[PDB]
Symmetry: D2
Subunit: 410 residues, 4 copies
Amino acid sequence: PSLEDLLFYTIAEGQEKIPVHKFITALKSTGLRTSDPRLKECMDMLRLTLQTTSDGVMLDKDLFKKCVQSNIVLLTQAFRRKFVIPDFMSFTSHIDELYESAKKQSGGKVADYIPQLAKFSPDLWGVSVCTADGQRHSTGDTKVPFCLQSCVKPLKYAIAVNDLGTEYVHRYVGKEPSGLRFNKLFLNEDDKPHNPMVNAGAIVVTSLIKQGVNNAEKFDYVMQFLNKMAGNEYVGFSNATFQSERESGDRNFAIGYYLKEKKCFPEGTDMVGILDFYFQLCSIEVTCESASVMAATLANGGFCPITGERVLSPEAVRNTLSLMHSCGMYDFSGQFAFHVGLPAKSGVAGGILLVVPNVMGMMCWSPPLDKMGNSVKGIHFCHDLVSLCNFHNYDNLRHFAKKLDPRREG
Amino acid sequence: PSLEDLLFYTIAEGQEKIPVHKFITALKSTGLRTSDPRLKECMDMLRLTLQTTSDGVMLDKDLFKKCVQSNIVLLTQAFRRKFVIPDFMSFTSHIDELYESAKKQSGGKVADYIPQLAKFSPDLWGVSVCTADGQRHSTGDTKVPFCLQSCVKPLKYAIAVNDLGTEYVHRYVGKEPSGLRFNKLFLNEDDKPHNPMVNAGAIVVTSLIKQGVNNAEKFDYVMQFLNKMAGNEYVGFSNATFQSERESGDRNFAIGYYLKEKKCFPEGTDMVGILDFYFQLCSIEVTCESASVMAATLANGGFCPITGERVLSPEAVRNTLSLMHSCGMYDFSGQFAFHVGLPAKSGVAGGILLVVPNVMGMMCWSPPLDKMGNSVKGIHFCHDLVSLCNFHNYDNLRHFAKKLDPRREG
Amino acid sequence: PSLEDLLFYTIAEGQEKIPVHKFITALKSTGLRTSDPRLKECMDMLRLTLQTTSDGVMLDKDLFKKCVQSNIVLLTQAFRRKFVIPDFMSFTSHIDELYESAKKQSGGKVADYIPQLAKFSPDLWGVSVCTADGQRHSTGDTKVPFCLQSCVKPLKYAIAVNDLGTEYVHRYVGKEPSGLRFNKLFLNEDDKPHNPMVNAGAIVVTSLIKQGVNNAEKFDYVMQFLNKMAGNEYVGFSNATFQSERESGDRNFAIGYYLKEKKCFPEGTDMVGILDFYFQLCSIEVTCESASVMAATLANGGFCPITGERVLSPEAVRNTLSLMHSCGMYDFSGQFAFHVGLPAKSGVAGGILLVVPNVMGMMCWSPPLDKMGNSVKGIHFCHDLVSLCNFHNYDNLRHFAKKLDPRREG
Amino acid sequence: PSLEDLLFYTIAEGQEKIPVHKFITALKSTGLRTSDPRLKECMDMLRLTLQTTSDGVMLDKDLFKKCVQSNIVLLTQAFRRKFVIPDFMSFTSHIDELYESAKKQSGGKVADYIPQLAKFSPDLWGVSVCTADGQRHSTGDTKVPFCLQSCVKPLKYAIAVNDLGTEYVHRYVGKEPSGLRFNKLFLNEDDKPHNPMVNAGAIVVTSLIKQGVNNAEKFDYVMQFLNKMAGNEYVGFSNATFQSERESGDRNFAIGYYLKEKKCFPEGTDMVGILDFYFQLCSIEVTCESASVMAATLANGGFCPITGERVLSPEAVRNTLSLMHSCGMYDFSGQFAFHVGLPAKSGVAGGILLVVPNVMGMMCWSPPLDKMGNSVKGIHFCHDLVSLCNFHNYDNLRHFAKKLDPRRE
Ligand SMILES: Nc1nnc(N2CCC(Oc3nnc(NC(=O)Cc4ccccc4)s3)CC2)s1
Ligand SMILES: Nc1nnc(N2CCC(Oc3nnc(NC(=O)Cc4ccccc4)s3)CC2)s1
């Protein structure tokens, strides 16, 4: 026996030849994209032989082995239906319907407090999925850059705990939600901001990362870190939204000065620089696709699903998922956790970074917000999704009524 | 082939016939108790044939065949290492280590608010486990009765939603936590109590179950309900603590009138009578073993794991597990959700009702309370337990660092 | 010289005789009512001689002397324009203008929570004046009885401090106002109700008066006390409004139990009896005339203006006038203290008990309330009144712009 | 009759000439200082004739007439015991006892947050009085300069209402006290600061004075105003404490931006410039004497008692006294209003600006603060004073038990 050969006959079909395009679409049906980083050596070997023998590019048992031996373990888990979602093909056709039904929630208002999000059309709407195994699906305007805005907070919280530990980080930031009419206070009674998902705690968390280097290097470190979380997919930066956030951040300076007087930053902090770093981190640009991979990184215990690298310590990813659950969706956090029960974080640009732990990561984007600051179509999508699949954090994996479970077969 | 025959060879060793005790301890090693209701027909036939021929109590292939013939499916998941916890034996010696570790947290104060909770010794400490498949382990004082006190709040919430639906119930009770600065208010900003786990919201929920019958039938309806959740193990009632709870409930009467004034009960409610039914529900008695079966019922999508009947609709168990997470441990709810991340509920008698969804239910019981009203040893046990097992709601089931996973084998 | 001789010539006209009506009309022009208690002996001696000599009916110097001998000190200070308001008659024609200007404020809502306050017509409106010297004026429906409701709180506070002292009384009740979204709390941070002018503190003050006797004796004592304060003018009681206050006082029972749980009553308090005494005290009845005398008792350092008896210790009246200033007009206290600056107290029946210290006491009564619970015309009158006279607590008695000062001559 | 002659015989005492010093101590015994501005023409004429004839300094009837003719109206109310406090001589010996009783309350902590108020010794303590008629008394360390700090807030409130009116001003600042549970918020429920006496409300009121001018003239405008309130007595400015307030006002800058975010300033306001003007107004310095004249100005319906000049409209002085009563002493405002019942304002330098309407104005000064920020000795003095005299806003002027009435004989 041999694994690459047994895999050859699984796809060879009993036939003696594999047309390689038949291999490529058998591959994409896994949901894996041809461009997957864990697959490069095999596509290197495929683009090589698509030149060597332009004569009927069918692969025999020996030549197929010559391309896929290097990636055979991941190719076989893909083809022996061992990924977290075995029938990915049907699942995307449910993701499509959920996308198209949220696509008719035309209500809401595009945040216009800056001219940069004000120029974004209300008709943009994209949903991107990446599972814990790297299966990909996207639908809508999923390659348009937009800023993370307030979706950056868990990402930077993760880095801070990843680099410094839970106990150090939470001397400066609380670990609970305020209370639905305490969105107006900055501090809890330990004179600590309530949690990293609000502007007060975000400004404090920003204060802890890479102390002692300048703001240019600090930003560099976060970009390198956010690069690994998305498996080197698109991470960018909008200078335009940066300047309009620095000229308009009256409430943020208010928070900085309040935090400075009440001695909530670590020793030797330059408060006004931290606010400039903060406005920077909120105009890091993503797409629906790249950011869905970062979301899958947290769904996966801190291991990037399309590269296999350890990017965050499991302690950092649990804390962040805990704190997204409670505090992630403004005054809709409490109701969102009850009805949807998925760690999620929203942003002023209309993004929702969603995690379904041990299944998949996601990013939704439609600019128009509802009156609580959450993307209209984005929020409508996350309801239908939990309505449909037993992904609610406190669903039962065995008895779950008329819901669907994508992690099983028949 | 056929099922009773193949298992026979697994236990037979290739020997003879199986000595009946060798079958029994092989059975108990799964963690099932001989008393399991799903096993009654099989133990009835073994006690019969242990009479039919008293010389030579060993079972050949045909005699074993018709003793386990009726319960063969559950016997096979038991013997084929298919229960949710395969090595129950090693795991229980981990529960014992955790138990003996919390047993040295001698601090705290036994609630003295009535002479009935004061009558409990501080060195009582019991932990009882019930998995979603019915494997059991107990350690410590797990047969001593005590009242649920506030551990009854999610149970009646579940019953209320099970009978009435999410939409009706949450017209009278909110679904979020107060906020560590609203632990003293009764009503949230819609003049609904904040959630079913606070005394105000509990009292409101009590006003909803089985409206229109008298308090005697109402009690019967809730007790019959709790009997199915505990698979008919001990569910009792302390009249003694009841008399002390009704004479000392000034704050509850205080809550009762305020709710009446602001019309938070359903029409035709007898407020002062609803307050008696409430005091009753707080002195229903359990032991650690009986109540751990109640907790496993919620871990199990609403199916009693040791009897198999459906007791609660998945909507009832999800909502209840959502709100135990957020609002379950008094003002320690936030830290508990962050650090332990498991649905749980405490009571002033020293109970902690714990749920690890899709795995097991638990009840920890030591009377001495800490400074927030949560049992000292209970809270220490529930910290160590998540430190040890990847049970924190947001652990990753694939990458979980040096934690143990009892759901996996070698 | 001799005083009664001096006074005869002031009225005598240079003439022989003074006709008896000419004395009476000279008397009422002082503003004193002939029925004044400090005048009884003189009108007694007048009704004596209106029989002795039915044909006169003029008094010579020896006979005028025989009627005014007994009351001469008070009669001349009246006639030598030594009363606090020298030209009382012109002053009453300004009170008439103020009354007639508020009488065109037709808005507001009559409190309907009990059927007894709902039966009062919205077109009832009365203003009654009694100065620190006993000059009286009334305009409108000033002899219609109505309940004090919440106007009773200072009256009983005065009695409590009068009998027990500031230091004892204020172990149970604060001395400050809450804060304008804290109309909803019961206790301040020291577990004391905030001040005697809110229902929580009122109920507690009610617990201090005449401890150790039953509720019938306790009420009797307060009636005897309110009797001296109104100089034996009309104080009555509506059992009707009492019965609807006890059947509808859910918030007060709510407050009663909260206070009992937090141990805010004095030892040996029967909580439920205290609430019954409280409902009684709010259904004491007055008219505009009768109650304005109580207000003058507070305007006069604790001495009843129409009897001269010391009824309250000066400590009792300052405290009460202090707390009426801060806390007297529901959420309108702050606005009322700024713009009107007079110690005042309102009630849900539409009463306003007003004090201009060292000048006069008042009672306004119109049933229709504004949106904060204060009678429309009562509030409109008190604005117009302070607009007109330098009566605002922080007016200057020497430089007061274009305002009128009724205590001066020309 | 003749006004000047009638006085001559009252002090002449049956004699033919009045020794000029005998006139002088009879003058000062009313409590007037010879330095009174309303008396200048009369003292000018006295030292002139004290030169014209260095010959036996006694005054006959016709020469006395020519000295006080110009100021005779004020001299007669002084000598016919018609001032608001007739026996000023006995009363000041009550102020002295009250002073020496507060002087032994050694508790409290001198504010140390800037090295400039930390530079003040805790044993400094001074009480200065000014009546509505100009009678003066001082005792203790009453000529030591110190900054008004938060004692300036009602002064600038008054100036804003005097210049703008109650209604305009209170579109930006509330009129009630927070509530002993709202000492940490900036805004009340209408997104307006609670009242002019808190840092948030003061900062906004500061935003209303003399809009459209630069900060240099704005200061000039406020100073000219404070000079008239003190009758041109000492009003200064500490640059030293100013620089330290600009470096350490993190919480004030915190208030500035929050107010900017919530649109609580008038249009075209430069917030950060307003904050420097604010720190400027908070380190204007007074002595106990000069500022005691400011307090009497508010006691006097807006007329400076020692010059006769109208400085504030009665609308501005009433509002300022209403709000001093309610909101004037940090978290002690409630108890202070109950037990003392007098308009007052404190500052972190150890000042208490006190007003007894229609009687007198005052300034107490001892640096060490109690835990609420109010001078220890000052609060002890203001209690003792009201225990003694029926000045409590709601004492009764007719029946007041064992208290004194200095307005009586
Ligand atoms: N009308 C308005 N809206 N929002 C307003 N703000 C309120 C003041 C803010 O500064 C502070 N915020 N919370 C503070 N509270 C604490 O630190 C201790 C603490 C005590 C009790 C409970 C929770 C914590 S202090 C700025 C924004 S004011
Ligand atoms: N939405 C709603 N409106 N009204 C509601 N109430 C129901 C229950 C409430 O009980 C209490 N009232 N005041 C309390 N305050 C204290 O004990 C001391 C204290 C500590 C710290 C800071 C302030 C004060 S506790 C009464 C009103 S709930």
